[PDB]
Scaffold this active site. Structure first.
Site, PDB file in Angstrom:
ATOM      1  CG  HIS A 122      42.377 -51.591  32.500  1.00  0.00           C
ATOM      2  ND1 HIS A 122      41.327 -52.560  33.548  1.00  0.00           N
ATOM      3  CD2 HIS A 122      42.395 -52.196  31.002  1.00  0.00           C
ATOM      4  CE1 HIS A 122      41.310 -53.714  32.115  1.00  0.00           C
ATOM      5  NE2 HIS A 122      42.107 -53.449  30.873  1.00  0.00           N
TER       6      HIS A 122
ATOM      7  CD  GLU B 143      42.254 -52.994  20.010  1.00  0.00           C
ATOM      8  OE1 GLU B 143      42.890 -53.817  19.315  1.00  0.00           O
ATOM      9  OE2 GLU B 143      40.895 -53.491  20.750  1.00  0.00           O
TER      10      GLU B 143
HETATM   11  C1  TPP Z   1      44.453 -53.963  22.763  1.00  0.00           C
HETATM   12  C2  TPP Z   1      44.095 -54.663  23.313  1.00  0.00           C
HETATM   13  N1  TPP Z   1      42.348 -54.359  23.321  1.00  0.00           N
HETATM   14  C3  TPP Z   1      41.181 -55.135  23.841  1.00  0.00           C
HETATM   15  C4  TPP Z   1      41.593 -55.764  25.321  1.00  0.00           C
HETATM   16  C5  TPP Z   1      40.575 -55.973  25.401  1.00  0.00           C
HETATM   17  N2  TPP Z   1      40.746 -57.714  25.631  1.00  0.00           N
HETATM   18  C6  TPP Z   1      41.310 -58.392  27.618  1.00  0.00           C
HETATM   19  S1  TPP Z   1      40.617 -59.537  27.199  1.00  0.00           S
HETATM   20  C7  TPP Z   1      40.438 -59.766  25.236  1.00  0.00           C
HETATM   21  C8  TPP Z   1      39.389 -60.784  24.710  1.00  0.00           C
HETATM   22  C9  TPP Z   1      40.828 -61.829  24.303  1.00  0.00           C
HETATM   23  O1  TPP Z   1      40.432 -63.300  23.467  1.00  0.00           O
HETATM   24  P1  TPP Z   1      41.193 -64.608  23.516  1.00  0.00           P
HETATM   25  O2  TPP Z   1      42.870 -63.574  22.812  1.00  0.00           O
HETATM   26  O3  TPP Z   1      40.504 -65.318  22.651  1.00  0.00           O
HETATM   27  O4  TPP Z   1      41.863 -64.999  24.983  1.00  0.00           O
HETATM   28  P2  TPP Z   1      40.737 -65.828  26.047  1.00  0.00           P
HETATM   29  O5  TPP Z   1      40.571 -65.149  26.625  1.00  0.00           O
HETATM   30  O6  TPP Z   1      39.244 -66.465  25.492  1.00  0.00           O
HETATM   31  O7  TPP Z   1      42.197 -66.350  26.029  1.00  0.00           O
HETATM   32  C10 TPP Z   1      40.044 -58.420  25.258  1.00  0.00           C
HETATM   33  C11 TPP Z   1      39.420 -57.924  24.087  1.00  0.00           C
HETATM   34  C12 TPP Z   1      43.140 -56.150  25.704  1.00  0.00           C
HETATM   35  N3  TPP Z   1      43.713 -56.403  26.693  1.00  0.00           N
HETATM   36  N4  TPP Z   1      44.443 -55.278  24.851  1.00  0.00           N
HETATM   37 CL    CL Z   2      42.758 -56.196  29.794  1.00  0.00          CL
END
Ligand code: TPP
Ligand code: CL
Ligand code: TPP
Ligand code: CL
Ligand code: K
Ligand code: K
Ligand code: K
Ligand code: K
Ligand code: MN
Ligand code: MN
Lengths: 329, 369, 329, 369
Positions: free
Chosen positions: A133, A63
């Site tokens: 959220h 971000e």
């Molecule tokens: C600071 C923040 N930005 C965005 C999100 C939304 N978000 C929840 S899971 C995710 C993907 C995370 O991917 P990764 O770290 O590769 O884990 P995976 O789901 O592939 O296990 C996102 C963008 C979040 N929870 N926190």
């Molecule tokens: Cl999330």
């Protein structure tokens, strides 16, 4: 009024605003996490196929970098429409927003600016979103000279306010109430149109009390206006603030000068919430008209809970009960 | 192996990958401490006039530093950051750029402005916050900016310019007018999260930007043993898929060659480059001097004459700066937004009234109108 | 009162508090940028030689990491006293502070906590610090349930408030007015002592008007109390709020109930500044006693300027003139 | 070369350092897709009982996922994140840890809790936010925490746990009781600035921590081509001076060996280790099954019996969870601070009054007292 319209829900009215922007402004790009495939709330569906992968694209999951990157685009004069996936995750960008975007023009003597920046983000509670959220961060931004903060209440308001934020020459945060993304649809013009910033809207006139809110909470105080008229024969003037800063001090004081009483309401916690700024200002300008204390009906001073949400929010009953007492003060 | 995150073979032996820190990325050098070109095939053979411009910009910057630094010590200005040891990195890299390449930086980049001919009177106006400052006196001294010279106004928060610079490079790519962005920062600033954001976005979004990290072994009091444990900052580039090199920041020719070549490829290929220039917290000016002498392009007499002329240009600009009024206090309120909100005009108006009544208590004597 | 004392300025009273903490709490460590050699305001001088390089140490130049690291220490029960070099640079840590430290205990049902965290930071204007060496960020933090924000006005107040923040079992931000670091010294006890959090202090009693401020601005309103008594024969009650959240609502309402009038003052910008929270609350609880509008005398809604500082700050003249009008309302 | 920032020689030839992405850090594997040990000298020869515990934890986690996932689809719970493809990384790494090693993670770490014997009824209580949730129903489902099992409560903001984990490792070092911290995150979370903060602090402060990055090629919709351009996350470790390795996350034995060895060295040497486990968005469970069969440690009958018993344990815990009341609404106000501020009690009191009068309009039927 505005030509051919179409039933849109809020997510649809967002895509319409974004599509109209890209169509008429060749510099404009939209970027953030997962915007390419349409976004997690479907707000950018179809736009990358339509306008190109260099104009609607995914960034890494960072971000602070999303906002810093957006500021750099806007410094060249190009329109940058950044998305932060939930308003709750805007805080890693707080330094770019507050120390950089907001101060860019001032500190340079207007040699440089990021006015072509807009950051749009899902906002407010959603029934089950709990701590991260659900947040309404507007008051954190309200203390920052140099940004605009804007929050619509419906699909029609959303498209016209988003178009103004996109086109305004100052860095804007547009907060999209996510619980309305797929709620009731209303007619929204297909072609571009603007609703002015820093202008509240009186959606119902009345004579006994003024109610002010923004986003989803506007529908809450509309129902409280109905309840009050029905149960107490009390005439409420109902006002949607719309722009958090710079805010329409004039429209709110004019109303309180007429009614003599004010109740302000927002989902964000009471302490340091934006209702205290409106309250203290209204008191300063309308002091001799106040029949009763200005009431603030807000979320409690706690983080936003999962299972206890029904008991946390400043719902119509909380507001109605506060209005009742205020009438009898 | 069928994993989408990485292209690689299997290995059947447990082996942890070790950093090579003791023998790191070597330091590119063109000329030795005596100003001698070490390997003729790397000589840029810059023409005399350009090389003298390098020398004169480095030395004039050093003269101005001396004067303004002493001015800070006397309390005539509130803040100063010098350029000592950084003259070579900044003049040598600026010279490899096109004039319209956009520059982002922070506190040690006045050399870039000097090469681009920013008037001495304007460096001064910003330090004194006087009527001639196009920054309107709003920022601390040394927070220079020039829209005409494509030099983005400095801000105090470290590393914030790094992802901004990447955005401006993305926007340049789209505009298709063959421009690069350069972004300067120190090794301490490279520890902030905004450096990791900038580096990563530059590679995945394929941006024509040069990251220029100046590594002098210290961030205020903090030595690098306390700042990172890898092989400096250059070793981090390849991990983001960024082409990287490390250079002798005391060698203007080495800084120039790496910058020139980074610019050529960044622009052609739309890819980021990382240059880490090593410096000290032997000196770029004397090293270039020994080079001028050996070519027969300079001498003691010319050096004394230039020392005298540059001192006087600087002092002329200095004395004039000190004597100008500061801007009208009305200017504290403008440019907050592009337009001035009515509630902000109302505060401007309250100060005007306040000064009508209580003005004898304010230093109104020094401020314009 | 508190045993042997010594003349200390504010920086000295800070080192005294930090030294006393490390002496009696073996878990405590102090870390941040350039703290090992004594810190850029000399607040940690001598402490690494005295207590060891594993207890007073430099981190990399990364504020989000400084706070995140501090939270991790505190999660194990150890005392973590982090420093952010200027309050202006606390914003990269805003997400760790607000989404993490503040919510750590709540969101875990008290299975985990970071209450042993204190973040201390230089704060407020300094004559020439312009945009990024001058800021007072307290109101940004005030809207965040779960942190405490504390700000002393003198060397004696500083040591006792810092000792309370260090020992309190909630994450605390302690903001040290940097213009006082080397100002006048006062007697400060050598040994540890505590001043309570969430308690304002009435430093001068009066009957006509209440004045509230914090940090350096307390000395401003003390002088305004003198001016008013001298020039208008008006008796001011002067109050140092000290803790921004949770704040001493009780002490402030009691006073306004007695005097009928309130002026609040802070260097931070007006809009969304903490004075609006005190104003709106006081109005709600003391409405029937208000003789005149509650006044807020604050910095303008602009970034903090270098050369125009003398015209920006809410100085004694701004405050006196506001009080004058309020008396004649 | 005399520069304090780097140990290195000079080079007299301009050469940019290129990332090796096409041929990256190879993937450590112990057993092939048929459950065959590939190189006997790498076999951990885990005893039968432990290996069966691995198998049973992986499969029971998968049964619970199936049930809770369907529960989310029916709207009986509001949110669920499964563990499919992640059972091996999590059970195999947990098994290499001491029981008291502190675990930080986010959404795919329930496998660690399962290996550490967290009761099914408590995974359930958190998802339903019922009276048995020690988290008091405050967080979204799957935000598990256990103080007894040394598993730090999950939060939604990505990567925030990474520098916190480094702090807890620093504090453990000081306490001198031979403990390591492990911190799990995905390749997408590794793009946040907090990952660069954590990685760097761990090396300069010399912390006994294992960073465990699970790389499955995607962050929601975003493939890795859009997340980074270096050789995954492992390639970034050496740049922070961190010893790094990449492993097959479908091979519990490979995850176990790397974790065990990282723990041994992190604790002994006070240094961080980075493990990047490659997974898919061939499967850890079936691969371990083929291993059990070849040792004669499992068979079809045992597998069907275990499938049935685990289904019933899960459904017993499920039905009980669904039937319990939610906590008293009073609990929305506690633990904000350790103590409850008087102004917060006053808000608690206002809700109590509100519900006295208007309670018929609230779902009071489901909440305790
Ligand atoms: C600071 C923040 N930005 C965005 C999100 C939304 N978000 C929840 S899971 C995710 C993907 C995370 O991917 P990764 O770290 O590769 O884990 P995976 O789901 O592939 O296990 C996102 C963008 C979040 N929870 N926190
Ligand atoms: Cl999330
Ligand atoms: C976000 C932020 N934190 C801290 C500071 C204080 N600060 C000003 S310069 C500096 C050291 C920067 O070092 P480096 O980046 O190596 O540059 P150098 O001074 O060695 O040229 C620090 C910590 C700052 N300006 N911004
Ligand atoms: Cl600084
Ligand atoms: K805009
Ligand atoms: K900067
Ligand atoms: K504390
Ligand atoms: K997290
Ligand atoms: Mn440095
Ligand atoms: Mn992933």
């Amino acid at each position: 009024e505005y030509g051919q319209t179409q039933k849109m829900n809020l997510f649809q009215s967002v895509t319409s605003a974004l599509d109209n922007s890209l169509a008429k402004d060749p510099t404009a790009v939209i970027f953030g996490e997962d915007v390419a495939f349409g976004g997690v709330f479907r707000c950018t569906v179809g736009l990358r196929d339509k306008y190109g992968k260099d104009r609607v694209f995914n960034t890494p999951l960072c971000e602070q970098g999303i906002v810093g990157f957006g500021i750099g685009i806007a410094v060249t004069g190009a329109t940058a429409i950044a998305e932060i996936q939930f308003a709750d995750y805007i805080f890693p960008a707080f330094d770019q927003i507050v120390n950089e975007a907001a101060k860019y023009r001032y500190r340079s003597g207007d040699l440089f600016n990021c006015g072509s920046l807009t950051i749009r983000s899902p906002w407010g509670c959603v029934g089950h979103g709990a701590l991260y959220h659900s947040q309404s961060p507007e008051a954190f931004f309200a203390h920052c000279p140099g940004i605009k903060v804007v929050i619509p209440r419906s699909p029609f308001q959303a498209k016209g306010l988003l178009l103004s934020c996109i086109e305004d020459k100052n860095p804007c945060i547009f907060f999209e109430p996510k619980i309305l993304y797929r709620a009731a649809a209303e007619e929204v013009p297909i072609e571009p149109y603007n609703i002015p910033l820093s202008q509240a809207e009186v959606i119902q006139e009345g004579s006994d009390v003024t109610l002010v809110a923004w986003g989803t909470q506007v529908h809450v105080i509309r129902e409280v206006a109905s309840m009050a008229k029905e149960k107490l024969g009390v005439s409420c003037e109902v006002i949607d603030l719309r722009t958090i800063i710079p805010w329409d001090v004039d429209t709110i004081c004019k109303s309180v000068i007429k009614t003599g009483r004010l109740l302000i309401s927002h989902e964000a916690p009471l302490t340091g919430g934006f209702a205290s700024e409106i309250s203290s200002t209204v008191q300063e300008e309308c002091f001799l008209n106040l029949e009763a204390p200005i009431s603030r009906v807000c979320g409690y001073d706690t983080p936003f809970p999962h299972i206890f949400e029904p008991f946390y929010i400043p719902d119509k009953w909380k507001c109605y009960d506060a209005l009742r007492k205020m009438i009898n003060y | 192996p069928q994993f989408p995150g990485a292209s690689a073979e299997f290995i059947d032996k447990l082996e942890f990958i070790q950093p090579n820190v003791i023998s790191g990325i070597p330091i590119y050098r063109v000329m030795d401490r005596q100003g001698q070109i070490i390997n003729p095939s790397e000589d840029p053979h810059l023409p005399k006039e350009k090389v003298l411009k390098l020398y004169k910009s480095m030395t004039l910057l050093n003269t101005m530093d001396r004067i303004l630094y002493e001015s800070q010590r006397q309390g005539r200005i509130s803040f100063y950051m010098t350029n000592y040891g950084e003259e070579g990195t900044h003049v040598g890299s600026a010279a490899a750029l096109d004039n319209t390449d956009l520059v982002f930086g922070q506190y040690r980049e006045a050399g870039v402005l000097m090469y681009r001919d920013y008037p001495l009177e304007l460096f001064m106006a910003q330090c004194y916050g006087n009527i001639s400052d196009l920054g309107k006196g709003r920022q601390m001294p040394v927070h220079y900016g020039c829209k005409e010279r494509h030099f983005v106004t400095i801000s105090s928060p470290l590393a914030t310019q790094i992802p901004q610079a990447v955005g401006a490079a993305y926007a340049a790519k789209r505009a298709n007018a063959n421009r690069v962005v350069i972004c300067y920062f120190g090794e301490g600033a490279a520890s902030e999260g905004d450096a990791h954001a900038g580096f990563n976005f530059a590679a995945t979004l394929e941006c024509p930007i040069i990251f220029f990290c100046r590594n002098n072994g210290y961030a205020i009091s903090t030595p690098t043993s306390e700042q990172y444990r890898g092989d400096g900052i250059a070793a981090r580039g390849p991990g983001y898929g960024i082409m990287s090199i490390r250079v002798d920041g005391n060698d203007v020719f080495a800084v120039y060659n790496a910058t020139k070549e980074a610019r050529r490829r960044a622009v052609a290929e739309n890819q980021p480059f990382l240059i880490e220039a090593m410096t000290y917290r032997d000196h770029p000016i004397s090293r270039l001097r020994h080079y001028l002498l050996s070519q027969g392009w300079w001498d003691e007499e010319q050096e004394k004459a230039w020392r005298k002329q540059s001192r006087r240009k600087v002092m002329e600009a200095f004395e004039q700066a000190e004597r100008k009024p500061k801007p009208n206090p009305n200017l504290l309120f403008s440019d907050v937004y592009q337009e001035m909100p009515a509630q902000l005009r109302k505060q401007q108006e309250s100060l005007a009234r306040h000064l009508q009544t209580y003005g004898e208590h304010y230093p109104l004597d020094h401020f314009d109108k």
